[PDB]
Amino acid sequence: LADLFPGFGSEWINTSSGRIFARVGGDGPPLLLLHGFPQTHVMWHRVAPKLAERFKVIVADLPGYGWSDMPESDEQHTPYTKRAMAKQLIEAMEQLGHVHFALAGHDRGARVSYRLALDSPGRLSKLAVLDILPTYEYWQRMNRAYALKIYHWSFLAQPAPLPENLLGGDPDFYVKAKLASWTRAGDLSAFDPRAVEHYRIAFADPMRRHVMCEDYRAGAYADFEHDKIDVEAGNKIPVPMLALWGASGAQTPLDVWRKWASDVQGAPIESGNFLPEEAPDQTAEALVRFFS
Amino acid sequence: LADLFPGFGSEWINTSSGRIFARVGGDGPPLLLLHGFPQTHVMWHRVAPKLAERFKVIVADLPGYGWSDMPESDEQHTPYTKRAMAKQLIEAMEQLGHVHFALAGHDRGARVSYRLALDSPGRLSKLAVLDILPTYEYWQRMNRAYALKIYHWSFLAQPAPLPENLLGGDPDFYVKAKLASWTRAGDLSAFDPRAVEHYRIAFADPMRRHVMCEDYRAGAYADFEHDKIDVEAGNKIPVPMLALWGASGIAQSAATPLDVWRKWASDVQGAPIESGNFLPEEAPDQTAEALVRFFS
Numbered sequence A: 001l002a003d004l005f006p007g008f009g010s011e012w013i014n015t016s017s018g019r020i021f022a023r024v025g026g027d028g029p030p031l032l033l034l035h036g037f038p039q040t041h042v043m044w045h046r047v048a049p050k051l052a053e054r055f056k057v058i059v060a061d062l063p064g065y066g067w068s069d070m071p072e073s074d075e076q077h078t079p080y081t082k083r084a085m086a087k088q089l090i091e092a093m094e095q096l097g098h099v100h101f102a103l104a105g106h107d108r109g110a111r112v113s114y115r116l117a118l119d120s121p122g123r124l125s126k127l128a129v130l131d132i133l134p135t136y137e138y139w140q141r142m143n144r145a146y147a148l149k150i151y152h153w154s155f156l157a158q159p160a161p162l163p164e165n166l167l168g169g170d171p172d173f174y175v176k177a178k179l180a181s182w183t184r185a186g187d188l189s190a191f192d193p194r195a196v197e198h199y200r201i202a203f204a205d206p207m208r209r210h211v212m213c214e215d216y217r218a219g220a221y222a223d224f225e226h227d228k229i230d231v232e233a234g235n236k237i238p239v240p241m242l243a244l245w246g247a248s249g250a251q252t253p254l255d256v257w258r259k260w261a262s263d264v265q266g267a268p269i270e271s272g273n274f275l276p277e278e279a280p281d282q283t284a285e286a287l288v289r290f291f292s
Numbered sequence B: 001l002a003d004l005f006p007g008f009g010s011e012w013i014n015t016s017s018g019r020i021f022a023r024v025g026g027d028g029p030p031l032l033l034l035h036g037f038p039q040t041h042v043m044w045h046r047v048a049p050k051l052a053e054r055f056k057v058i059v060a061d062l063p064g065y066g067w068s069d070m071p072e073s074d075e076q077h078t079p080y081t082k083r084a085m086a087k088q089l090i091e092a093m094e095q096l097g098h099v100h101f102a103l104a105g106h107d108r109g110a111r112v113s114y115r116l117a118l119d120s121p122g123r124l125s126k127l128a129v130l131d132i133l134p135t136y137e138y139w140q141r142m143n144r145a146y147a148l149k150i151y152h153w154s155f156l157a158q159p160a161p162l163p164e165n166l167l168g169g170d171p172d173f174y175v176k177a178k179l180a181s182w183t184r185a186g187d188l189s190a191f192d193p194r195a196v197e198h199y200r201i202a203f204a205d206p207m208r209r210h211v212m213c214e215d216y217r218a219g220a221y222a223d224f225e226h227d228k229i230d231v232e233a234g235n236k237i238p239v240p241m242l243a244l245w246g247a248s249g250i251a252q253s254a255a256t257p258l259d260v261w262r263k264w265a266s267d268v269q270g271a272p273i274e275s276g277n278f279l280p281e282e283a284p285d286q287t288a289e290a291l292v293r294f295f296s
Ligand SMILES: [Cl-]
Pocket: A150
């Protein structure tokens, strides 16, 4: 497996729920980057160096993902709820002495990120979310068209062992097909082959796949219920926010986030749903300018 | 594989879209029975003998299912649309000299049946649909709760080869889990083990699994569009109709099925029966009685 982060160290960070793995580089104000599904921290390999010019950049594997430990789940999928993941990553950041930091997330990591901002806004100076709407909004939008487009939200959330059993027959094909399907190009050409190998190796492990299903089960149930409480309470994120999204993938995303946050700017980028790899120069530029 | 219709004949019926396999028994008015997913004609084995006491019973494998031929599909999934399946089965019935007949369908076969009644009502004396609402009605109900409870409508409709690839690793496990999960009890006890082996063997063929995926792809697209045209036009089935459904099945999930069917048909009756989604196997005496009384 290739080292795709020149000048970055490798850290295992202890928490009460298990170790969080991170690549760490740069100096200056602290910036945490959180990947999503079906990827690992290495999805930031194209943009993290530009960020590390100006920030101390911490590129973490989500709880249960990549090389992070996998806490044992339960009947409500608790450690893979975004609330729980946010609490664990707040603990990890405290181990480094970071109790107020900047945060950017993509996909599931962006879900952790806006949940973190709702639950513990004092932890964040600035927030970026990439290629997402709140989990509540996806579910509110779930008609025939959406059930077909984002079928994996219901499929991966089916009670165990249904998706686990299916995913084990040929995991390489499934993860490579998802990676390609969600890009503008519809193939693997936006990715570094070395990064695809990281994703494939992670996805090849049945325990790692079970975590992903627990993540989507949380997304269908507890995450949705947490979001619903905020909607009903009229809670809006007060942290300055940036919403970025691939125009060919979230997509009016800024209209949606304005209902969820009181200080948000945003922009589409010509890309599918893997912005930091499909449009790394654009994405890095927007993030550097926002966080500075 | 076992003979579950002892005494019944067999036919391999030619049509422009491929052969239809059927077991044929009894004597009297013609009655066609159409199975669904993930099953074959043998799911009628517990009610078919009783019906054969009063009707000429034709127990057919759906186009692409069981031992019927599997036509090559196309970009619109045409031969596995319920419109096309109904045309094909109309041809098959004509080969037998049946141009006006009674019809009962279950699950996908019931979808073929109500589409048949919408496109070609003159072909049916009476119609029974088991364990279903119209395809349009399931999609209209699509929200979070529904998407989570009936995931396979969207899963199996994903573009090929995604579900085919997933189902190929351990097909026995998936189909046996579907059969058990959709029964009242949640196990395989409602089935004759010999019938389960018919279902398992069919599902073990990748070409048969591909057909099933095409069926659900049609169900997500062309079948839905066909249904949408009829309900937006206010078209109702004029053929006298019976709707039966298992109380624990998904046709009675977020709907009162008879009220749904009254939107689609101008002369409909029906009733729930205590059962999951496999009425003719889970509640055979009750199902057989309802059908005999209705078609008589
Ligand atoms: Cl998604």
